[PDB]
mmCIF file with all atom_site columns, C-alpha atoms in Angstrom:
data_model
loop_
_atom_site.group_PDB
_atom_site.id
_atom_site.type_symbol
_atom_site.label_atom_id
_atom_site.label_alt_id
_atom_site.label_comp_id
_atom_site.label_asym_id
_atom_site.label_entity_id
_atom_site.label_seq_id
_atom_site.pdbx_PDB_ins_code
_atom_site.Cartn_x
_atom_site.Cartn_y
_atom_site.Cartn_z
_atom_site.occupancy
_atom_site.B_iso_or_equiv
_atom_site.pdbx_formal_charge
_atom_site.auth_seq_id
_atom_site.auth_comp_id
_atom_site.auth_asym_id
_atom_site.auth_atom_id
_atom_site.pdbx_PDB_model_num
ATOM 1   C CA . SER A 1 1   ? 59.577 96.994  95.804  1.00 47.90 ? 1   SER A CA 1
ATOM 2   C CA . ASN A 1 2   ? 61.189 100.260 96.984  1.00 49.80 ? 2   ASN A CA 1
ATOM 3   C CA . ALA A 1 3   ? 64.699 99.146  96.496  1.00 49.12 ? 3   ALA A CA 1
ATOM 4   C CA . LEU A 1 4   ? 65.707 102.095 94.257  1.00 51.17 ? 4   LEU A CA 1
ATOM 5   C CA . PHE A 1 5   ? 64.777 104.945 96.613  1.00 53.61 ? 5   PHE A CA 1
ATOM 6   C CA . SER A 1 6   ? 66.645 103.131 99.401  1.00 58.47 ? 6   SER A CA 1
ATOM 7   C CA . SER A 1 7   ? 69.725 102.549 97.211  1.00 55.49 ? 7   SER A CA 1
ATOM 8   C CA . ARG A 1 8   ? 69.650 106.204 96.326  1.00 57.13 ? 8   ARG A CA 1
ATOM 9   C CA . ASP A 1 9   ? 69.389 107.288 100.018 1.00 59.43 ? 9   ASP A CA 1
ATOM 10  C CA . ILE A 1 10  ? 72.434 105.079 100.804 1.00 56.28 ? 10  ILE A CA 1
ATOM 11  C CA . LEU A 1 11  ? 74.484 106.265 97.827  1.00 54.38 ? 11  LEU A CA 1
ATOM 12  C CA . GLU A 1 12  ? 73.775 109.891 98.803  1.00 50.83 ? 12  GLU A CA 1
ATOM 13  C CA . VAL A 1 13  ? 75.089 109.278 102.335 1.00 48.40 ? 13  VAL A CA 1
ATOM 14  C CA . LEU A 1 14  ? 78.106 107.320 101.062 1.00 47.86 ? 14  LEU A CA 1
ATOM 15  C CA . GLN A 1 15  ? 78.889 110.107 98.585  1.00 49.61 ? 15  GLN A CA 1
ATOM 16  C CA . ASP A 1 16  ? 78.866 112.579 101.477 1.00 49.90 ? 16  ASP A CA 1
ATOM 17  C CA . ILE A 1 17  ? 81.419 110.663 103.475 1.00 48.34 ? 17  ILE A CA 1
ATOM 18  C CA . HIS A 1 18  ? 83.554 110.398 100.391 1.00 46.35 ? 18  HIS A CA 1
ATOM 19  C CA . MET A 1 19  ? 83.379 114.165 99.755  1.00 47.57 ? 19  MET A CA 1
ATOM 20  C CA . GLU A 1 20  ? 84.205 115.056 103.364 1.00 47.09 ? 20  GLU A CA 1
ATOM 21  C CA . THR A 1 21  ? 86.953 112.469 103.890 1.00 44.24 ? 21  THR A CA 1
ATOM 22  C CA . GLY A 1 22  ? 88.432 111.680 100.431 1.00 44.54 ? 22  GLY A CA 1
ATOM 23  C CA . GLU A 1 23  ? 88.966 108.090 101.649 1.00 44.84 ? 23  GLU A CA 1
ATOM 24  C CA . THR A 1 24  ? 87.894 104.798 99.973  1.00 44.76 ? 24  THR A CA 1
ATOM 25  C CA . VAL A 1 25  ? 84.391 104.274 101.204 1.00 40.22 ? 25  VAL A CA 1
ATOM 26  C CA . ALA A 1 26  ? 82.177 101.177 100.816 1.00 39.90 ? 26  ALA A CA 1
ATOM 27  C CA . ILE A 1 27  ? 78.878 99.393  101.521 1.00 38.96 ? 27  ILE A CA 1
ATOM 28  C CA . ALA A 1 28  ? 79.369 95.689  102.260 1.00 42.11 ? 28  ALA A CA 1
ATOM 29  C CA . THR A 1 29  ? 77.325 92.681  103.320 1.00 40.86 ? 29  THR A CA 1
ATOM 30  C CA . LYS A 1 30  ? 78.092 88.995  103.988 1.00 37.61 ? 30  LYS A CA 1
ATOM 31  C CA . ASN A 1 31  ? 78.178 86.084  101.640 1.00 36.40 ? 31  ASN A CA 1
ATOM 32  C CA . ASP A 1 32  ? 78.384 82.978  103.902 1.00 36.62 ? 32  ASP A CA 1
ATOM 33  C CA . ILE A 1 33  ? 81.712 83.627  105.765 1.00 35.57 ? 33  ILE A CA 1
ATOM 34  C CA . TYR A 1 34  ? 83.064 86.130  103.191 1.00 33.06 ? 34  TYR A CA 1
ATOM 35  C CA . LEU A 1 35  ? 82.771 89.889  102.933 1.00 33.96 ? 35  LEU A CA 1
ATOM 36  C CA . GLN A 1 36  ? 80.862 91.070  99.824  1.00 33.93 ? 36  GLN A CA 1
ATOM 37  C CA . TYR A 1 37  ? 81.111 94.674  98.574  1.00 36.32 ? 37  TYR A CA 1
ATOM 38  C CA . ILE A 1 38  ? 77.889 96.240  97.211  1.00 34.58 ? 38  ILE A CA 1
ATOM 39  C CA . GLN A 1 39  ? 79.474 99.593  96.259  1.00 34.97 ? 39  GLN A CA 1
ATOM 40  C CA . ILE A 1 40  ? 82.902 101.095 96.504  1.00 34.97 ? 40  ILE A CA 1
ATOM 41  C CA . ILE A 1 41  ? 83.898 104.639 95.831  1.00 36.40 ? 41  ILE A CA 1
ATOM 42  C CA . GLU A 1 42  ? 87.698 104.951 95.377  1.00 33.95 ? 42  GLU A CA 1
ATOM 43  C CA . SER A 1 43  ? 89.786 107.498 97.258  1.00 35.73 ? 43  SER A CA 1
ATOM 44  C CA . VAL A 1 44  ? 91.360 110.524 95.621  1.00 36.92 ? 44  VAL A CA 1
ATOM 45  C CA . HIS A 1 45  ? 94.514 110.297 97.800  1.00 40.57 ? 45  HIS A CA 1
ATOM 46  C CA . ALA A 1 46  ? 97.801 109.282 96.234  1.00 40.86 ? 46  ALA A CA 1
ATOM 47  C CA . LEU A 1 47  ? 98.323 106.490 98.661  1.00 41.58 ? 47  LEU A CA 1
ATOM 48  C CA . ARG A 1 48  ? 95.064 104.505 98.844  1.00 42.35 ? 48  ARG A CA 1
ATOM 49  C CA . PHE A 1 49  ? 93.119 101.246 99.000  1.00 45.66 ? 49  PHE A CA 1
ATOM 50  C CA . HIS A 1 50  ? 92.463 99.741  95.600  1.00 47.29 ? 50  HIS A CA 1
ATOM 51  C CA . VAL A 1 51  ? 89.847 97.088  96.416  1.00 46.91 ? 51  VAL A CA 1
ATOM 52  C CA . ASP A 1 52  ? 90.336 94.024  94.188  1.00 45.81 ? 52  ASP A CA 1
ATOM 53  C CA . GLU A 1 53  ? 86.844 92.498  93.831  1.00 41.80 ? 53  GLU A CA 1
ATOM 54  C CA . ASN A 1 54  ? 88.029 89.054  92.695  1.00 40.61 ? 54  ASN A CA 1
ATOM 55  C CA . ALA A 1 55  ? 89.635 88.794  96.191  1.00 41.34 ? 55  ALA A CA 1
ATOM 56  C CA . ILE A 1 56  ? 87.952 86.312  98.568  1.00 43.05 ? 56  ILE A CA 1
ATOM 57  C CA . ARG A 1 57  ? 87.954 87.726  102.034 1.00 43.57 ? 57  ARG A CA 1
ATOM 58  C CA . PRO A 1 58  ? 86.887 85.927  105.209 1.00 44.70 ? 58  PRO A CA 1
ATOM 59  C CA . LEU A 1 59  ? 84.908 87.942  107.786 1.00 45.51 ? 59  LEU A CA 1
ATOM 60  C CA . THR A 1 60  ? 87.629 87.553  110.443 1.00 44.78 ? 60  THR A CA 1
ATOM 61  C CA . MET A 1 61  ? 90.037 89.652  108.339 1.00 46.32 ? 61  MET A CA 1
ATOM 62  C CA . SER A 1 62  ? 88.451 93.129  108.373 1.00 45.44 ? 62  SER A CA 1
ATOM 63  C CA . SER A 1 63  ? 86.656 95.488  110.713 1.00 48.43 ? 63  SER A CA 1
ATOM 64  C CA . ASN A 1 64  ? 83.718 95.267  108.227 1.00 48.51 ? 64  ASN A CA 1
ATOM 65  C CA . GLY A 1 65  ? 83.837 91.518  108.845 1.00 52.86 ? 65  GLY A CA 1
ATOM 66  C CA . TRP A 1 66  ? 83.626 91.845  112.654 1.00 52.88 ? 66  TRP A CA 1
ATOM 67  C CA . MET A 1 67  ? 80.733 94.276  112.288 1.00 52.22 ? 67  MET A CA 1
ATOM 68  C CA . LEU A 1 68  ? 78.813 91.779  110.095 1.00 54.41 ? 68  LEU A CA 1
ATOM 69  C CA . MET A 1 69  ? 79.587 88.765  112.322 1.00 54.92 ? 69  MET A CA 1
ATOM 70  C CA . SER A 1 70  ? 78.329 90.752  115.308 1.00 56.89 ? 70  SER A CA 1
ATOM 71  C CA . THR A 1 71  ? 74.843 90.260  113.779 1.00 57.99 ? 71  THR A CA 1
ATOM 72  C CA . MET A 1 72  ? 74.910 86.402  113.859 1.00 57.71 ? 72  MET A CA 1
ATOM 73  C CA . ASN A 1 73  ? 74.053 84.018  116.750 1.00 58.68 ? 73  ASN A CA 1
ATOM 74  C CA . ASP A 1 74  ? 76.963 82.407  118.676 1.00 57.81 ? 74  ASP A CA 1
ATOM 75  C CA . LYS A 1 75  ? 76.572 78.992  117.062 1.00 62.16 ? 75  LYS A CA 1
ATOM 76  C CA . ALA A 1 76  ? 77.074 80.741  113.677 1.00 63.17 ? 76  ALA A CA 1
ATOM 77  C CA . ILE A 1 77  ? 79.979 82.916  114.901 1.00 64.59 ? 77  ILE A CA 1
ATOM 78  C CA . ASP A 1 78  ? 81.898 79.870  116.208 1.00 63.35 ? 78  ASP A CA 1
ATOM 79  C CA . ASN A 1 79  ? 81.383 78.064  112.889 1.00 63.07 ? 79  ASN A CA 1
ATOM 80  C CA . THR A 1 80  ? 82.537 81.189  111.053 1.00 60.46 ? 80  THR A CA 1
ATOM 81  C CA . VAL A 1 81  ? 85.765 81.661  113.016 1.00 61.10 ? 81  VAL A CA 1
ATOM 82  C CA . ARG A 1 82  ? 86.511 77.947  112.782 1.00 62.97 ? 82  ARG A CA 1
ATOM 83  C CA . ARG A 1 83  ? 85.831 77.791  109.042 1.00 64.00 ? 83  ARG A CA 1
ATOM 84  C CA . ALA A 1 84  ? 87.609 81.050  108.463 1.00 65.50 ? 84  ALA A CA 1
ATOM 85  C CA . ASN A 1 85  ? 90.716 79.806  110.311 1.00 68.58 ? 85  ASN A CA 1
ATOM 86  C CA . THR A 1 86  ? 91.180 76.868  107.926 1.00 74.89 ? 86  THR A CA 1
ATOM 87  C CA . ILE A 1 87  ? 91.498 79.381  105.118 1.00 74.57 ? 87  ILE A CA 1
ATOM 88  C CA . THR A 1 88  ? 93.563 82.177  106.652 1.00 77.05 ? 88  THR A CA 1
ATOM 89  C CA . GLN A 1 89  ? 95.915 79.675  108.229 1.00 73.68 ? 89  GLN A CA 1
ATOM 90  C CA . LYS A 1 90  ? 97.069 78.635  104.757 1.00 76.15 ? 90  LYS A CA 1
ATOM 91  C CA . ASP A 1 91  ? 98.851 82.012  105.124 1.00 78.73 ? 91  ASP A CA 1
ATOM 92  C CA . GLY A 1 92  ? 99.913 81.547  108.770 1.00 80.35 ? 92  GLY A CA 1
ATOM 93  C CA . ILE A 1 93  ? 97.092 83.701  110.203 1.00 80.91 ? 93  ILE A CA 1
ATOM 94  C CA . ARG A 1 94  ? 94.543 82.348  112.707 1.00 81.00 ? 94  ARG A CA 1
ATOM 95  C CA . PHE A 1 95  ? 92.401 84.001  115.430 1.00 82.09 ? 95  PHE A CA 1
ATOM 96  C CA . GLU A 1 96  ? 91.549 82.164  118.642 1.00 82.79 ? 96  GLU A CA 1
ATOM 97  C CA . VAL A 1 97  ? 87.810 81.655  118.882 1.00 85.18 ? 97  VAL A CA 1
ATOM 98  C CA . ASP A 1 98  ? 87.990 83.042  122.427 1.00 81.76 ? 98  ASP A CA 1
ATOM 99  C CA . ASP A 1 99  ? 89.475 86.451  121.507 1.00 83.74 ? 99  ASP A CA 1
ATOM 100 C CA . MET A 1 100 ? 87.656 86.877  118.214 1.00 83.39 ? 100 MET A CA 1
ATOM 101 C CA . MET A 1 101 ? 84.354 86.103  120.019 1.00 84.26 ? 101 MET A CA 1
ATOM 102 C CA . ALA A 1 102 ? 85.423 88.731  122.553 1.00 85.57 ? 102 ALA A CA 1
ATOM 103 C CA . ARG A 1 103 ? 86.253 91.378  119.888 1.00 85.09 ? 103 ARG A CA 1
ATOM 104 C CA . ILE A 1 104 ? 82.913 90.714  118.221 1.00 83.45 ? 104 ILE A CA 1
ATOM 105 C CA . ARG A 1 105 ? 80.990 91.091  121.471 1.00 82.78 ? 105 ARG A CA 1
ATOM 106 C CA . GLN A 1 106 ? 82.798 94.449  122.018 1.00 84.64 ? 106 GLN A CA 1
ATOM 107 C CA . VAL A 1 107 ? 81.997 95.695  118.502 1.00 79.99 ? 107 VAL A CA 1
ATOM 108 C CA . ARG A 1 108 ? 78.291 94.855  118.947 1.00 82.30 ? 108 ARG A CA 1
ATOM 109 C CA . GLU A 1 109 ? 78.483 96.844  122.219 1.00 84.41 ? 109 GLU A CA 1
ATOM 110 C CA . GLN A 1 110 ? 80.318 100.015 121.065 1.00 85.58 ? 110 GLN A CA 1
ATOM 111 C CA . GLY A 1 111 ? 78.293 100.318 117.747 1.00 85.37 ? 111 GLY A CA 1
ATOM 112 C CA . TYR A 1 112 ? 81.190 100.360 115.264 1.00 85.11 ? 112 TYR A CA 1
ATOM 113 C CA . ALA A 1 113 ? 84.518 98.711  114.460 1.00 85.88 ? 113 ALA A CA 1
ATOM 114 C CA . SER A 1 114 ? 87.986 99.836  113.557 1.00 80.87 ? 114 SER A CA 1
ATOM 115 C CA . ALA A 1 115 ? 91.256 98.063  112.819 1.00 81.82 ? 115 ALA A CA 1
ATOM 116 C CA . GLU A 1 116 ? 94.880 98.874  112.234 1.00 81.31 ? 116 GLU A CA 1
ATOM 117 C CA . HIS A 1 117 ? 97.065 96.848  109.895 1.00 78.70 ? 117 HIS A CA 1
ATOM 118 C CA . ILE A 1 118 ? 94.193 94.367  109.260 1.00 74.97 ? 118 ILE A CA 1
ATOM 119 C CA . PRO A 1 119 ? 93.955 92.914  106.637 1.00 73.89 ? 119 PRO A CA 1
ATOM 120 C CA . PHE A 1 120 ? 96.873 95.088  105.440 1.00 72.80 ? 120 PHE A CA 1
ATOM 121 C CA . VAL A 1 121 ? 99.979 96.551  106.974 1.00 74.26 ? 121 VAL A CA 1
ATOM 122 C CA . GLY A 1 122 ? 99.850 100.357 106.878 1.00 74.01 ? 122 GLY A CA 1
ATOM 123 C CA . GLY A 1 123 ? 96.075 100.435 106.539 1.00 72.81 ? 123 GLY A CA 1
ATOM 124 C CA . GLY A 1 124 ? 93.333 101.702 108.856 1.00 72.36 ? 124 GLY A CA 1
ATOM 125 C CA . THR A 1 125 ? 89.605 101.169 108.562 1.00 74.91 ? 125 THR A CA 1
ATOM 126 C CA . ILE A 1 126 ? 86.473 102.262 110.426 1.00 74.56 ? 126 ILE A CA 1
ATOM 127 C CA . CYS A 1 127 ? 82.965 101.043 109.844 1.00 74.77 ? 127 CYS A CA 1
ATOM 128 C CA . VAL A 1 128 ? 79.402 101.046 111.138 1.00 73.08 ? 128 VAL A CA 1
ATOM 129 C CA . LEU A 1 129 ? 76.321 98.941  110.688 1.00 75.29 ? 129 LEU A CA 1
ATOM 130 C CA . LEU A 1 130 ? 73.578 100.442 108.517 1.00 73.19 ? 130 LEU A CA 1
ATOM 131 C CA . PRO A 1 131 ? 70.029 100.436 110.022 1.00 69.73 ? 131 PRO A CA 1
ATOM 132 C CA . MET A 1 132 ? 68.503 98.432  107.218 1.00 69.69 ? 132 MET A CA 1
ATOM 133 C CA . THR A 1 133 ? 69.112 95.034  105.630 1.00 69.76 ? 133 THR A CA 1
ATOM 134 C CA . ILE A 1 134 ? 69.588 94.250  101.953 1.00 73.17 ? 134 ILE A CA 1
ATOM 135 C CA . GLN A 1 135 ? 68.197 90.892  100.822 1.00 73.67 ? 135 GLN A CA 1
ATOM 136 C CA . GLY A 1 136 ? 67.817 89.679  104.413 1.00 74.07 ? 136 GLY A CA 1
ATOM 137 C CA . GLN A 1 137 ? 71.580 90.321  104.926 1.00 72.29 ? 137 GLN A CA 1
ATOM 138 C CA . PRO A 1 138 ? 72.963 92.943  107.290 1.00 72.18 ? 138 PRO A CA 1
ATOM 139 C CA . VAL A 1 139 ? 74.891 95.828  105.676 1.00 70.70 ? 139 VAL A CA 1
ATOM 140 C CA . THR A 1 140 ? 77.892 97.853  106.640 1.00 70.06 ? 140 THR A CA 1
ATOM 141 C CA . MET A 1 141 ? 79.315 101.244 105.754 1.00 69.82 ? 141 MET A CA 1
ATOM 142 C CA . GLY A 1 142 ? 82.996 101.896 106.157 1.00 67.85 ? 142 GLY A CA 1
ATOM 143 C CA . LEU A 1 143 ? 86.044 103.835 105.169 1.00 66.33 ? 143 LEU A CA 1
ATOM 144 C CA . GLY A 1 144 ? 89.650 102.799 104.563 1.00 68.89 ? 144 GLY A CA 1
ATOM 145 C CA . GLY A 1 145 ? 92.982 104.510 103.914 1.00 72.78 ? 145 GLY A CA 1
ATOM 146 C CA . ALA A 1 146 ? 96.618 104.990 104.985 1.00 71.88 ? 146 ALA A CA 1
ATOM 147 C CA . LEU A 1 147 ? 96.879 104.408 108.757 1.00 71.25 ? 147 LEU A CA 1
ATOM 148 C CA . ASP A 1 148 ? 98.293 107.779 109.683 1.00 74.07 ? 148 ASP A CA 1
ATOM 149 C CA . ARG A 1 149 ? 95.526 109.717 107.904 1.00 75.05 ? 149 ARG A CA 1
ATOM 150 C CA . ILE A 1 150 ? 93.032 107.500 109.672 1.00 75.92 ? 150 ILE A CA 1
ATOM 151 C CA . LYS A 1 151 ? 94.617 107.841 113.147 1.00 78.13 ? 151 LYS A CA 1
ATOM 152 C CA . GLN A 1 152 ? 94.782 111.563 112.855 1.00 80.29 ? 152 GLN A CA 1
ATOM 153 C CA . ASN A 1 153 ? 91.170 111.935 111.722 1.00 80.64 ? 153 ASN A CA 1
ATOM 154 C CA . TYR A 1 154 ? 89.700 109.124 113.777 1.00 81.35 ? 154 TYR A CA 1
ATOM 155 C CA . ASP A 1 155 ? 87.132 111.042 115.814 1.00 85.25 ? 155 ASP A CA 1
ATOM 156 C CA . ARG A 1 156 ? 85.918 113.087 112.815 1.00 83.15 ? 156 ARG A CA 1
ATOM 157 C CA . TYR A 1 157 ? 85.684 110.032 110.529 1.00 83.13 ? 157 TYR A CA 1
ATOM 158 C CA . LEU A 1 158 ? 83.816 108.026 113.135 1.00 81.15 ? 158 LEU A CA 1
ATOM 159 C CA . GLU A 1 159 ? 81.445 110.933 113.796 1.00 79.68 ? 159 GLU A CA 1
ATOM 160 C CA . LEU A 1 160 ? 80.606 111.125 110.057 1.00 84.36 ? 160 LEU A CA 1
ATOM 161 C CA . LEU A 1 161 ? 79.869 107.403 109.843 1.00 86.71 ? 161 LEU A CA 1
ATOM 162 C CA . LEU A 1 162 ? 77.612 107.471 112.900 1.00 86.97 ? 162 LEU A CA 1
ATOM 163 C CA . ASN A 1 163 ? 75.771 110.551 111.675 1.00 86.66 ? 163 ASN A CA 1
ATOM 164 C CA . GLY A 1 164 ? 75.334 108.794 108.314 1.00 86.05 ? 164 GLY A CA 1
ATOM 165 C CA . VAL A 1 165 ? 73.503 106.054 110.163 1.00 86.44 ? 165 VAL A CA 1
ATOM 166 C CA . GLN A 1 166 ? 71.127 108.646 111.736 1.00 83.66 ? 166 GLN A CA 1
ATOM 167 C CA . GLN A 1 167 ? 70.396 110.075 108.294 1.00 82.59 ? 167 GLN A CA 1
ATOM 168 C CA . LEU A 1 168 ? 69.200 106.637 107.118 1.00 81.21 ? 168 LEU A CA 1
ATOM 169 C CA . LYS A 1 169 ? 66.850 105.596 109.945 1.00 79.79 ? 169 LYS A CA 1
ATOM 170 C CA . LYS A 1 170 ? 64.059 106.722 107.481 1.00 80.31 ? 170 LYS A CA 1
ATOM 171 C CA . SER A 1 171 ? 65.221 104.360 104.673 1.00 79.63 ? 171 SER A CA 1
ATOM 172 C CA . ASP A 1 172 ? 63.551 100.968 104.069 1.00 81.58 ? 172 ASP A CA 1
ATOM 173 C CA . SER A 1 173 ? 65.125 97.527  104.103 1.00 80.63 ? 173 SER A CA 1
ATOM 174 C CA . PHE A 1 174 ? 64.753 95.712  100.745 1.00 80.99 ? 174 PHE A CA 1
ATOM 175 C CA . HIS A 1 175 ? 64.892 92.243  99.162  1.00 76.01 ? 175 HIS A CA 1
ATOM 176 C CA . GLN A 1 176 ? 65.959 92.920  95.516  1.00 77.51 ? 176 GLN A CA 1
#
Protein backbone atom coordinates (compact mmCIF):
# COMPACT_ATOMS: atom_id res chain seq x y z
CA SER A 1 0.00 0.00 0.00
CA ASN A 2 3.10 2.22 -0.32
CA ALA A 3 4.57 0.39 -3.21
CA LEU A 4 4.91 3.49 -5.46
CA PHE A 5 7.00 5.66 -3.13
CA SER A 6 9.32 2.68 -2.57
CA SER A 7 9.60 1.96 -6.32
CA ARG A 8 10.42 5.59 -6.84
CA ASP A 9 13.12 5.57 -4.09
CA ILE A 10 14.70 2.50 -5.77
CA LEU A 11 14.51 3.90 -9.30
CA GLU A 12 16.14 7.14 -8.08
CA VAL A 13 19.07 5.19 -6.60
CA LEU A 14 19.37 2.95 -9.68
CA GLN A 15 19.34 6.02 -11.93
CA ASP A 16 22.22 7.45 -9.89
CA ILE A 17 24.40 4.42 -10.37
CA HIS A 18 23.62 4.51 -14.05
CA MET A 19 24.59 8.20 -14.33
CA GLU A 20 27.85 7.73 -12.43
CA THR A 21 28.92 4.47 -14.07
CA GLY A 22 27.26 4.36 -17.54
CA GLU A 23 26.98 0.57 -17.12
CA THR A 24 23.88 -1.68 -17.53
CA VAL A 25 22.25 -1.57 -14.15
CA ALA A 26 19.36 -3.71 -12.84
CA ILE A 27 17.01 -4.66 -9.99
CA ALA A 28 16.34 -8.41 -9.86
CA THR A 29 14.55 -10.93 -7.68
CA LYS A 30 14.01 -14.72 -7.80
CA ASN A 31 11.36 -16.72 -9.51
CA ASP A 32 11.75 -20.29 -8.13
CA ILE A 33 15.35 -21.14 -9.24
CA TYR A 34 15.51 -18.45 -11.98
CA LEU A 35 16.65 -14.84 -11.91
CA GLN A 36 13.85 -12.34 -12.67
CA TYR A 37 14.61 -8.73 -13.68
CA ILE A 38 12.28 -6.03 -12.28
CA GLN A 39 13.99 -3.10 -14.05
CA ILE A 40 16.94 -2.71 -16.35
CA ILE A 41 18.53 0.47 -17.50
CA GLU A 42 20.78 -0.14 -20.56
CA SER A 43 24.36 1.09 -20.75
CA VAL A 44 25.48 3.92 -22.99
CA HIS A 45 28.84 2.23 -23.77
CA ALA A 46 29.49 0.87 -27.23
CA LEU A 47 30.32 -2.54 -25.96
CA ARG A 48 27.58 -3.54 -23.49
CA PHE A 49 25.15 -6.05 -22.01
CA HIS A 50 21.88 -6.26 -23.90
CA VAL A 51 19.70 -8.23 -21.46
CA ASP A 52 17.32 -10.52 -23.38
CA GLU A 53 14.26 -10.88 -21.12
CA ASN A 54 12.89 -14.02 -22.79
CA ALA A 55 16.12 -15.72 -21.54
CA ILE A 56 15.63 -18.24 -18.70
CA ARG A 57 18.49 -17.96 -16.30
CA PRO A 58 19.19 -20.25 -13.35
CA LEU A 59 20.44 -18.63 -10.12
CA THR A 60 23.77 -20.50 -10.25
CA MET A 61 24.75 -18.60 -13.43
CA SER A 62 25.15 -14.99 -12.23
CA SER A 63 26.49 -13.03 -9.29
CA ASN A 64 22.89 -11.72 -8.89
CA GLY A 65 21.88 -15.37 -8.58
CA TRP A 66 24.39 -16.13 -5.80
CA MET A 67 23.28 -13.01 -3.93
CA LEU A 68 19.61 -14.15 -4.08
CA MET A 69 20.38 -17.77 -3.13
CA SER A 70 22.34 -16.49 -0.14
CA THR A 71 18.92 -15.55 1.32
CA MET A 72 17.48 -19.13 1.29
CA ASN A 73 17.90 -21.94 3.89
CA ASP A 74 20.38 -24.76 3.10
CA LYS A 75 17.71 -27.32 2.24
CA ALA A 76 16.49 -24.85 -0.45
CA ILE A 77 20.01 -24.00 -1.68
CA ASP A 78 20.88 -27.69 -2.20
CA ASN A 79 17.64 -28.24 -4.13
CA THR A 80 18.41 -25.14 -6.21
CA VAL A 81 21.94 -26.15 -7.18
CA ARG A 82 20.79 -29.69 -7.91
CA ARG A 83 17.82 -28.56 -10.01
CA ALA A 84 19.87 -25.88 -11.66
CA ASN A 85 22.57 -28.39 -12.65
CA THR A 86 20.12 -30.52 -14.65
CA ILE A 87 19.47 -27.47 -16.80
CA THR A 88 22.91 -25.91 -17.21
CA GLN A 89 24.45 -29.30 -17.84
CA LYS A 90 22.47 -29.55 -21.09
CA ASP A 91 25.19 -27.04 -22.09
CA GLY A 92 28.10 -28.82 -20.34
CA ILE A 93 28.10 -26.50 -17.30
CA ARG A 94 27.60 -27.79 -13.74
CA PHE A 95 28.69 -26.50 -10.29
CA GLU A 96 29.54 -28.90 -7.47
CA VAL A 97 27.12 -28.43 -4.61
CA ASP A 98 30.13 -28.24 -2.28
CA ASP A 99 31.82 -25.25 -3.96
CA MET A 100 28.66 -23.40 -4.91
CA MET A 101 27.44 -23.75 -1.28
CA ALA A 102 30.84 -22.37 -0.28
CA ARG A 103 30.66 -19.38 -2.70
CA ILE A 104 27.17 -18.61 -1.44
CA ARG A 105 28.24 -18.70 2.19
CA GLN A 106 31.09 -16.26 1.29
CA VAL A 107 28.75 -13.87 -0.54
CA ARG A 108 26.36 -13.78 2.44
CA GLU A 109 29.43 -12.96 4.57
CA GLN A 110 31.10 -10.21 2.48
CA GLY A 111 27.74 -8.41 1.65
CA TYR A 112 27.95 -8.43 -2.16
CA ALA A 113 28.89 -10.60 -5.13
CA SER A 114 30.94 -10.23 -8.25
CA ALA A 115 31.83 -12.52 -11.14
CA GLU A 116 34.07 -12.58 -14.16
CA HIS A 117 33.11 -14.34 -17.37
CA ILE A 118 29.88 -15.66 -15.76
CA PRO A 119 27.41 -16.16 -17.41
CA PHE A 120 29.34 -14.60 -20.33
CA VAL A 121 32.92 -14.54 -21.50
CA GLY A 122 34.28 -10.99 -21.44
CA GLY A 123 31.69 -9.80 -18.94
CA GLY A 124 31.98 -8.58 -15.35
CA THR A 125 29.20 -7.98 -12.86
CA ILE A 126 28.87 -6.68 -9.30
CA CYS A 127 25.77 -6.69 -7.18
CA VAL A 128 24.36 -6.11 -3.71
CA LEU A 129 21.27 -7.08 -1.81
CA LEU A 130 18.68 -4.33 -1.31
CA PRO A 131 17.42 -3.82 2.29
CA MET A 132 13.80 -4.43 1.44
CA THR A 133 11.78 -7.24 -0.12
CA ILE A 134 9.34 -7.01 -3.02
CA GLN A 135 6.38 -9.39 -2.82
CA GLY A 136 8.03 -11.45 -0.08
CA GLN A 137 11.01 -12.02 -2.44
CA PRO A 138 14.50 -10.68 -1.78
CA VAL A 139 15.81 -8.08 -4.26
CA THR A 140 19.16 -7.31 -5.75
CA MET A 141 20.83 -4.32 -7.36
CA GLY A 142 23.69 -4.83 -9.74
CA LEU A 143 25.75 -3.58 -12.61
CA GLY A 144 27.23 -5.33 -15.64
CA GLY A 145 29.61 -4.46 -18.49
CA ALA A 146 32.82 -5.31 -20.37
CA LEU A 147 35.25 -7.02 -17.96
CA ASP A 148 38.10 -4.58 -18.31
CA ARG A 149 35.93 -1.54 -17.52
CA ILE A 150 34.63 -3.42 -14.52
CA LYS A 151 38.07 -4.55 -13.26
CA GLN A 152 39.47 -1.10 -13.55
CA ASN A 153 36.57 0.55 -11.72
CA TYR A 154 35.87 -2.24 -9.26
CA ASP A 155 36.35 -0.38 -5.98
CA ARG A 156 34.40 2.70 -7.15
CA TYR A 157 31.53 0.63 -8.59
CA LEU A 158 31.27 -1.48 -5.46
CA GLU A 159 31.35 1.64 -3.26
CA LEU A 160 28.42 3.13 -5.24
CA LEU A 161 26.33 -0.02 -4.88
CA LEU A 162 26.94 -0.25 -1.14
CA ASN A 163 26.19 3.43 -0.63
CA GLY A 164 22.99 2.92 -2.65
CA VAL A 165 21.96 0.36 -0.07
CA GLN A 166 22.51 2.92 2.76
CA GLN A 167 20.34 5.43 0.92
CA LEU A 168 17.44 2.94 0.94
CA LYS A 169 17.40 1.79 4.58
CA LYS A 170 14.44 4.30 4.91
CA SER A 171 12.38 2.64 2.11
CA ASP A 172 9.57 0.16 2.87
CA SER A 173 9.23 -3.44 1.73
CA PHE A 174 6.05 -4.02 -0.34
CA HIS A 175 3.71 -6.77 -1.56
CA GLN A 176 2.25 -5.37 -4.85
